[PDB]
Design an enzyme around this catalytic site. Structure first.
Site, PDB file in Angstrom:
ATOM      1  N   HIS A   1       0.755  -1.228   0.000  1.00  0.00           N
ATOM      2  CA  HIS A   1       0.000   0.000   0.000  1.00  0.00           C
ATOM      3  C   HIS A   1       0.779   1.267   0.000  1.00  0.00           C
ATOM      4  CE1 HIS A   1      -3.358  -2.681  -0.300  1.00  0.00           C
ATOM      5  NE2 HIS A   1      -2.984  -3.172   0.937  1.00  0.00           N
TER       6      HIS A   1
ATOM      7  N   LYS B   1      -2.380 -10.006  -8.928  1.00  0.00           N
ATOM      8  CA  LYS B   1      -3.338  -9.513  -7.899  1.00  0.00           C
ATOM      9  C   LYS B   1      -4.336  -8.569  -8.551  1.00  0.00           C
ATOM     10  CE  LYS B   1      -3.274  -7.611  -3.297  1.00  0.00           C
ATOM     11  NZ  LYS B   1      -3.224  -6.278  -2.638  1.00  0.00           N
TER      12      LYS B   1
ATOM     13  N   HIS C   1      -4.439  -3.743   6.978  1.00  0.00           N
ATOM     14  CA  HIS C   1      -5.412  -4.169   5.930  1.00  0.00           C
ATOM     15  C   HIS C   1      -5.942  -2.923   5.258  1.00  0.00           C
ATOM     16  CE1 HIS C   1      -9.066  -5.594   3.929  1.00  0.00           C
ATOM     17  NE2 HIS C   1      -9.890  -5.126   4.966  1.00  0.00           N
ATOM     18  N   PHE C   2      -5.997  -2.918   3.963  1.00  0.00           N
ATOM     19  CA  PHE C   2      -6.660  -1.793   3.257  1.00  0.00           C
ATOM     20  C   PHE C   2      -8.094  -2.202   2.915  1.00  0.00           C
ATOM     21  CE2 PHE C   2      -5.954   2.226   1.268  1.00  0.00           C
ATOM     22  CZ  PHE C   2      -7.086   2.336   0.442  1.00  0.00           C
ATOM     23  N   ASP C   3      -9.108  -1.520   3.381  1.00  0.00           N
ATOM     24  CA  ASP C   3     -10.526  -1.907   3.264  1.00  0.00           C
ATOM     25  C   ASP C   3     -11.158  -1.248   2.035  1.00  0.00           C
ATOM     26  OD1 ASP C   3     -12.402  -3.558   4.784  1.00  0.00           O
ATOM     27  OD2 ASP C   3     -13.646  -1.818   5.019  1.00  0.00           O
TER      28      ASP C   3
END
Length: 124
Positions: free
Chosen positions: A12, A41, A119-121
């Site tokens: 990220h 990905k 975590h990227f939501d």
């Protein structure tokens, strides 16, 4: 064995740029951050803020994560972000990405001691 915090950073974080340079940004960064390795990905977001600013979101607006968990934080201000998304022309090992530069709030899941993003939501 990557820790979770280090994986968020690798996937990220792109503080070296203010914004996505070319339409090419995504194919390049997805490659160099090793995200086209075993697979393409399919979706990933890069955040063009310093790490301090992004770790600070873990003390901002507490929200439900999309999976219903409650350790998600929404940033108070907008952040410079680039969305990377496989096209239809995308064929592993020849991963191809659409680059969308935007300025959005980010929502992250935080954990640990230090409480940091793992975590990227979403972005909104």
């Amino acid at each position: 064995k990557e820790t979770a915090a280090a994986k968020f950073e690798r996937q990220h974080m792109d503080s070296s740029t203010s914004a996505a340079s070319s339409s090419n940004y995504c194919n390049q960064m997805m490659k160099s951050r090793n995200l086209t390795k075993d697979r393409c990905k399919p979706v990933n977001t890069f955040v063009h803020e310093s790490l301090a600013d992004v770790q600070a979101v873990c003390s901002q607006k507490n929200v439900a994560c999309k999976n219903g968990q409650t350790n998600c934080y929404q940033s108070y201000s907008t952040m410079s972000i680039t969305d990377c998304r496989e096209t239809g022309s995308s064929k592993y090992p020849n991963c191809a990405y659409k680059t969308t530069q935007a300025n959005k709030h980010i929502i992250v899941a935080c954990e640990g001691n230090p409480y940091v993003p793992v975590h990227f939501d979403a972005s909104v």
